[PDB]
Design a protein around this nucleic acid. Structure first.
Lengths: 75, 212
RNA sequence: UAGUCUGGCACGGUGAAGAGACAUGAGAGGUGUAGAAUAAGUGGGAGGCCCGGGCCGCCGGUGAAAUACCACUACUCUGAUC
RNA sequence: CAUCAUUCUAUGGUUACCCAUCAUUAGAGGAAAUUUCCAAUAAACUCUGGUGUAAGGCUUAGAGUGAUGGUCGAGGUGCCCUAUUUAGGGUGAGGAGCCUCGGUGGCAGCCCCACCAAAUCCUCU
């Protein structure tokens, strides 16, 4: 009935709003980045290995099916 | 409906009980109508032709370039050329003032088309109608709007109101604005049927007087 | 076409209650945004208005139209008689 | 290349009340149900002209200019039926008529997400 139109690589604002507002959430899973920041699950995965490399997010537990990242803590 | 009784049309000198004001006044007339329809083809449009100037006071402009260049110098006229309308009837929306600034415009003879510009059917479409004439009369032919009769329109509230006199004139023009004034609006008649019931005579300010 | 059925009119009237009318007389009355203000609507109008001084406005601003100040009539509801 | 607004020049245009539209009248136009067809059938409403009234640049031609090189935000908009009546169950078509960037909640404001109504009915099943 409805057909979603997700983005495959970043537009100018979608990299800006990912590079800022991904750690400004509390959960970071590549299913909610695909939902909220309007991209595909593969990009949502590919856009978080480079934010773990940056020092903005933090990994909790890894699995083949689902990985759960979070904000970098207050401490 | 025929109404007249010029028997002893006096008691116009009874002024200083009917006035304890001081200033420049405008004497009016509101006449009584019953069963008129404005929604149908009943044309109550035109004038009642007075002779002896009740004398209105408002801003009058003259558009053109004629012998009237020399004639209307002694008026101390607000004269305006075509070279002073390219910012006048265009600056209408963005500047929110009454950008006409004078309460009349004009089309003449010798200037057969005054203005077929976008500011021609622009000016003759927003009231203060450019309707007065200055054909080739050439004795004054500008202040003869101030020295003219009176006009009145049909509308959707039916009531009529028009100025048959003014202050600063003799009282013997206000008996002359009873002779050549209301004798004609019985001849000026269609089956807007027997339109004249009663004529409530009244100055600028005063008390109900009655002459039929 | 007789007769009959039916409506109007005349003969043909007094009185009470009630209604919808309409002439004589009355209040409150009208909300596109918006200008600070329930724009009825026109001839307005930069001047009036009150016991020597004071407010209402022009404008800024909504909108062919903004009051102090003279009248009539549109026309919705309550309600008054020779 | 399409489109809207804004400022300046076209031997260019009706105003003794018109312009947009509220009104009305004169005129050209169809899907699906209903299959295996064919032409029907018959709307709802939509325009130009005309008259009374209420906006104002019009609508025609030139160029500098907002902000589009693509647009508006793209969503809410119905009847039927039930002792789930602030709830619950249906899903045919083809047309016209209006509020704002919602008010809150949850990883709180953006991007999603749920909900509380804005103005809707006319009819060919």
């Amino acid at each position: 009935r409805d057909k979603l139109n997700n983005l495959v690589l970043f537009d100018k604002a979608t990299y800006d709003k990912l590079c800022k507002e991904v750690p400004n959430y509390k959960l970071i899973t590549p299913a909610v980045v695909s939902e909220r920041l309007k991209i595909r699950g593969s990009l949502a995965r590919a856009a978080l290995q480079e934010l773990l490399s940056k020092g903005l997010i933090k990994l909790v537990s890894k699995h083949r099916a689902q990985v759960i990242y979070t904000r970098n803590t207050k401490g | 409906s025929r109404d007249t009784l010029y028997e002893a049309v006096r008691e116009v000198l009874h002024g200083n009980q009917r006035k304890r004001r001081k200033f420049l006044e405008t004497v009016e007339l509101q006449i009584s109508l019953k069963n008129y329809d404005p929604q149908k083809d009943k044309r109550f449009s035109g004038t009642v032709r007075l002779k002896s100037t009740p004398r209105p006071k408002f801003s009058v402009c003259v558009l053109g370039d004629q012998q009237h260049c020399d004639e209307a110098k002694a008026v101390d006229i607000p004269h305006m050329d075509i070279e002073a309308l390219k910012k006048l009837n265009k600056n209408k929306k963005l500047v929110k003032k009454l950008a006409k600034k004078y309460d009349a415009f004009l089309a003449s003879e010798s200037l057969i088309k005054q203005i077929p510009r976008i500011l021609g059917p622009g000016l003759n479409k927003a009231g203060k109608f450019p309707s007065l004439l200055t054909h080739n009369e050439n004795m004054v032919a500008k202040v003869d709007e101030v020295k003219s009769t009176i006009k009145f329109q049909m509308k959707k509230v039916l009531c009529l109101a028009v100025a048959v006199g003014h202050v600063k004139m003799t009282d013997d023009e206000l008996v002359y604005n009873i002779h050549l004034a209301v004798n004609f609006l019985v001849s000026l008649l269609k089956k807007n049927w027997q339109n004249v019931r009663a004529l409530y005579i009244k100055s600028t300010m005063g008390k109900p007087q009655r002459l039929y």
